[PDB]
DNA sequence: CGGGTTTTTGTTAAGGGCTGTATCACTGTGTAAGACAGGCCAGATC
């Protein structure tokens, strides 16, 4: 419940809104810088380390059999259990969208030096169109794993896309896609309780269930307080997917999800209205089949956040949240605050 | 197609005055960051 000032090094310009911090055994790694990778680091992945409330970036290299990936500004991060992550969707530095899916991992470790193995994965079947601003989770059902994808924005279709509205975006279909990591195949499932496309939501996972919280809908310009309970099941045949609406929803878009302890997450940040930025936090609780969203203490915000207009960040893993605000320009382009909650 | 006759059109010289054009020496627009080689201390080491 503390708010701390953070001093940043020289390449503060390499941090932009929409980045994605990734954790690997107590070590946080930066990703998604601004612009194409320069010659200071031909890969882009940087080591996230905070020492005495000071920020320093450190480059990193890949293995031989890796695949040099372009930076992405709105990917779909997802943990997995050796230990590895999944990246899907996002916007290339050329403002284009990428349908490819990535699997990062650790190759070697020697004296605080980490090597990665970026491996492109082929997707076959009911492949989704290139999306961004969505989420993806992994469910465990009877010793089997399966990826759940939902939401995301995208441009107009190939036909209706005109150069007078070339940057117009539209919410994708509310379809739910199960992604198999072994075969690299997907399957399109439609649900009756899903009517409005959702984006910038928050996905909380469990053993075999995933939960949906808040978001935004371009079709209506409304931030609904929804709570969906998707229980994916993996029998010996075709999987099963079911939805269920639950009371006690939150109206927030682009929130930050962190884990203080098991079966209890903390939500902070986001937006209530167009200009009414969310300030209060939110405490959840994951029981056997129930959920309980409740209010917690409101951390002491400084005079900068209370009168700002926009913010961004992501999770760090150790109950800490990396938060930044827009600075001046003529000066430092941004400021950055770390938040502690444990 | 010619004289007789007529009305238009130049033509010289020198000077005056208004108009147009070449000539002089110059300018303002080509203006922030990144790649790289060399030196150097902190530190794991056999």
UniProtKB/Swiss-Prot annotation:
Alphabetically ordered keywords of this record: Chromatin regulator, DNA recombination, Metal-binding, Nucleus, Zinc, Zinc-finger
Subcellular location as annotated: Nucleus
Cellular compartments per GO CC: nucleoplasm; nucleus
GO biological process: B cell differentiation; B cell homeostatic proliferation; B cell lineage commitment; defense response to bacterium; DN2 thymocyte differentiation; DNA recombination; mature B cell differentiation involved in immune response; negative regulation of T cell differentiation in thymus
Principal cellular location given in the protein's record: nucleus
Expression across tissues: Maturing lymphoid cells.
Record field: transmembrane: none
Phenotype when the gene is knocked out: Mice are viable but fail to produce mature B or T-lymphocytes. Very immature lymphoid cells are present in primary lymphoid organs. These cells do not rearrange their immunoglobulin or T-cell receptor loci. Double knockout with TREX1 does not show a visible phenotype.
Keyword Ligase appears in the UniProt entry: no
MF terms (GO), sorted A to Z: chromatin binding; DNA binding; histone H3K4me3 reader activity; phosphatidylinositol binding; phosphatidylinositol-3,4,5-trisphosphate binding; phosphatidylinositol-3,4-bisphosphate binding; phosphatidylinositol-3,5-bisphosphate binding; phosphatidylinositol-4,5-bisphosphate binding
Membership in a protein family: Belongs to the RAG2 family.
Subunit structure: Component of the RAG complex composed of core components RAG1 and RAG2, and associated component HMGB1 or HMGB2.
Its job: Core component of the RAG complex, a multiprotein complex that mediates the DNA cleavage phase during V(D)J recombination. V(D)J recombination assembles a diverse repertoire of immunoglobulin and T-cell receptor genes in developing B and T-lymphocytes through rearrangement of different V (variable), in some cases D (diversity), and J (joining) gene segments.
Domain notes: The atypical PHD-type zinc finger recognizes and binds histone H3 trimethylated on 'Lys-4' (H3K4me3).
Designated name of the protein: V(D)J recombination-activating protein 2
Organism for this UniProt entry: Mus musculus (Mouse)
Lineage of source species: Eukaryota, Metazoa, Chordata, Craniata, Vertebrata
Gene behind this protein: Rag2
């Amino acid at each position: 419940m503390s708010l701390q000032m953070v001093t940043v090094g020289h390449n503060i310009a390499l941090i932009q809104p929409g980045f994605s911090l990734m954790n690997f055994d107590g070590q946080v790694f930066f990703f998604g810088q601004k612009g194409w990778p320069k010659r200071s680091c031909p890969t882009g992945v940087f080591h996230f380390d905070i020492k005495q409330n000071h920020l320093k970036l450190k480059p990193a290299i890949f293995s031989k059999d890796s695949c040099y990936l372009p930076p992405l500004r709105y990917p779909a991060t997802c943990s997995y259990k050796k230990h590895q992550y999944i990246i899907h969707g996002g916007k290339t530095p050329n403002n284009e969208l990428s349908d490819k899916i990535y699997i990062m991992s650790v190759a070697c470790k020697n004296n605080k030096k980490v090597t990665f193995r970026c491996t492109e994965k082929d997707l076959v079947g009911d492949v989704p169109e290139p999306r961004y601003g969505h989420s993806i989770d992994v469910v465990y059902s009877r010793g089997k794993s399966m990826g759940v994808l939902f939401g995301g924005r995208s441009y107009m279709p190939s036909t209706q896309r005109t150069t007078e509205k070339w940057n117009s975006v539209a919410d994708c279909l509310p379809h739910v896609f199960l992604i198999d990591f072994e075969f690299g195949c997907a399957t399109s499932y439609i649900l009756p309780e899903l009517q409005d496309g959702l984006s910038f939501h928050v996905s909380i996972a469990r053993n075999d269930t995933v939960y949906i919280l808040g978001g935004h809908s371009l079709a209506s310009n409304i931030r609904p307080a929804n709570l969906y309970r998707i229980r994916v099941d993996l029998p010996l045949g075709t999987p099963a997917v079911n939805c269920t609406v639950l009371p006690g929803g939150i109206s927030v878009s682009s929130a930050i999800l962190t884990q203080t302890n098991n079966d209890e997450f903390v939500i902070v940040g986001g937006y209530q209205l167009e200009n009414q930025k969310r300030m209060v936090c939110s405490l959840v609780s994951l029981g056997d089949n129930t959920i309980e969203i409740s209010e917690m203490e409101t951390p002491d915000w400084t005079s900068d956040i209370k009168h700002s207009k926009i913010w961004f960040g992501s999770n760090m893993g150790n109950g800490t949240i990396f938060l930044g605000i827009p600075g001046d320009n003529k000066s430092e382009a941004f400021y950055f605050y770390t938040l502690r909650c444990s």
